[PDB]
Amino acid sequence: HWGYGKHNGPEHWHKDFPIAKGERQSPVDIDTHTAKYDPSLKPLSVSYDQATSLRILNNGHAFNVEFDDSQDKAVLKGGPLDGTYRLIQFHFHWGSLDGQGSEHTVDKKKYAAELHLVHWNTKYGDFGKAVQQPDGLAVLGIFLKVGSAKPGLQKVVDVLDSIKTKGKSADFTNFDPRGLLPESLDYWTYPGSLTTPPLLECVTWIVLKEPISVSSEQVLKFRKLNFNGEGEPEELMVDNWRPAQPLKNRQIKASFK
Ligand SMILES: NS(=O)(=O)c1cc(C(=O)O)c(NCc2ccco2)cc1Cl
Ligand SMILES: [Hg+2]
Ligand code: NA
Ligand SMILES: [Zn+2]
């Protein structure tokens, strides 16, 4: 099965998922001097007041915090997007040490981690239909650097003990994802893909310029999770990031001057 190790990591994924070598793969390096300001881009509208989180799951590659997406509650609109995109889950990618872990890079800089808030385009009715469309998904990406603690992350950190191994889940209601956002909503945007198999080319990426700070203790707890299931040899869940992929014939646009 695919993973992040020597024998099943990103360099192998193309064998089962040939789109890994496709024309709009993610992540990418954001070259800040080539990304052009686009005055036609709109402010991002993040409407999370009515979010209903349900559960947190260790899926064997990361952990997902899942939301009720059965009705318009937490939605992303504006920015580069046409229409309304509903929040379905968020997860992170992170490193074994603070100097790596992000998927996107900024002028080749790797952050300690990267948060992905995954949303699907409601014009397609359900997530499964949305991932058959080139504008089916919008992912809001937020970099994490190590410094001061992020208070809004601590509830996540504190439940991880209970989902140590693949396939474990726990109730995770009443979590407010607004507490994971930075001050500024300035962003870069480009067309891309899932960064995990099946690597589907459905995503409008919206990557915030401003990182959030989290404490060393917070990210250290991420690194105590396990890729393996209960009763199997312990493989720490670290370095669950895909490296930057070729930009090809794409443009990265900046929302800010
Ligand atoms: N890392 S990511 O944000 O590109 C991402 C990552 C994952 C993930 O499973 O880690 C994911 N799972 C849902 C799924 C299944 C088929 C299409 O989307 C979706 C996305 Cl967009
Ligand atoms: Hg997995
Ligand atoms: Na450009
Ligand atoms: Zn992701």
Neighbour count for residue 108 (Cβ, 10 Å): 9
Would you call 24 helix, strand, or coil by DSSP?
A: coil
CB-count exposure of residue 156 (10 Å: 0-12, 13-18, 19+): buried
> 10 Å Cβ neighbour count for 174?
10
Of the ligands numbered here, which is closest to the C-alpha atom of 166?
2
User: Could you identify the residue written with the tokens 């996107």?
Assistant: 104
Strand, helix or coil for residue 180: helix
- The pair of structure tokens assigned to 120 is 């699907």
Determine the structural domain holding residue 112 and report its residue range: 1-257
SS3 19: helix
Residue type, position 151, single letter: P
Neighbours of ion ligand 2 (CB under 5 A): 59-61
User: What is the count of structural domains for the chain?
Assistant: 1
What residues sit around ligand 3, an ion, with C-beta below 5 angstroms?
Answer: 34, 36, 251
Sign of the alpha-carbon dihedral angle for 66, 68, 71, 74: negative
Work out the angle at residue 177's Cα, subtended by the Cα atoms of residues 172 and 183, and round it to the nearest 5 degrees. Answer: 155
Separation of 180 CA from ligand 3 center, angstroms? 29
Residue that is written with structure tokens 């992929």 in the block? 245
Q: Note the residue count of the chain.
A: 257
Structure tokens at 11: 């360099």
Beta strand pairing status for 137-146 and 203-208? parallel
Rounded-to-10 torsion of CA 20, 21, 23, 25? 40
CA-based torsion, 93, 98, 100, 103: positive or negative: positive
Nearby residues of 62 by Cβ (< 8 Å), 6 or more positions away: 91, 92, 93, 237, 240
Sequence-distant (6+) residues with CB within 8 A of 135 are 82, 121, 202, 204
Return the exposure string of 197-229: e unless at least 16 CB atoms fall within 10 Å of the residue's CB, then b: bebbbbbbbbbbbebbebbeebbebbbebbbbe
Residue given tokens 């193309």 in the structure block: 14
Which two structure tokens, joined as six digits, stand for 246? 């070729």
* Cα 192 from Cα 253, distance rounded (Å): 13
How far is it, in rounded angstroms, from Cα 120 to Cα 205?
A: 12
Please state how this structure was obtained. X-ray
Give Cα separations from 225 to 36, 75, 89, 102 (angstroms): 39, 29, 19, 17
Testing ligand 1's pocket by substitution, the residue of 133, 194, 199 carrying the most ligand atoms inside 8 A of its CB is: 194
How does DSSP assign 103-141, residue by residue? SSEETTBPPSEEEEEEEEEGGGSSHHHHTTSTTSEEEEE
Question: Does the C-beta of 204 come closer than 6 Å to ligand 1?
Answer: no
Reduce the secondary structure of 49-106 to three states and give it as a string.
CCCCEEEEEECCCCEEEEECCCCCCCEEEECCCCCCEEEEEEEEEECCCCCCCCCCEE
173 with 147: CB under 8 angstroms? no
Please give the number of the atom of ligand 1 that sits closest to the Cα of 242. Answer: 1
Distance CA 167, CA 1 (A): 15
Give the chain's radius of gyration (CA, Å). 17
116 marked as binding residue: yes
Is residue 32 a known part of a binding site? no
Is-contact 236 226, C-beta < 8 A? Answer: yes
Tokens of 192: 């891309």
Catalytic status, residue 119? no
Burial class (CB in 10 A: 0-12, 13-18, 19+), 78: middle
Ligand 1 site, residue 115, Cβ cutoff 6 A: no
Q: Tokens at residue 12, please?
A: 């192998």
What are φ and ψ of residue 144, in 5° steps?
A: -115, 130
Give phi and psi for 36, each to the nearest 5.
-95, 140
Who's near 145: CB < 8 A, 6+ residues apart?
A: 111, 112, 211, 212, 213, 214
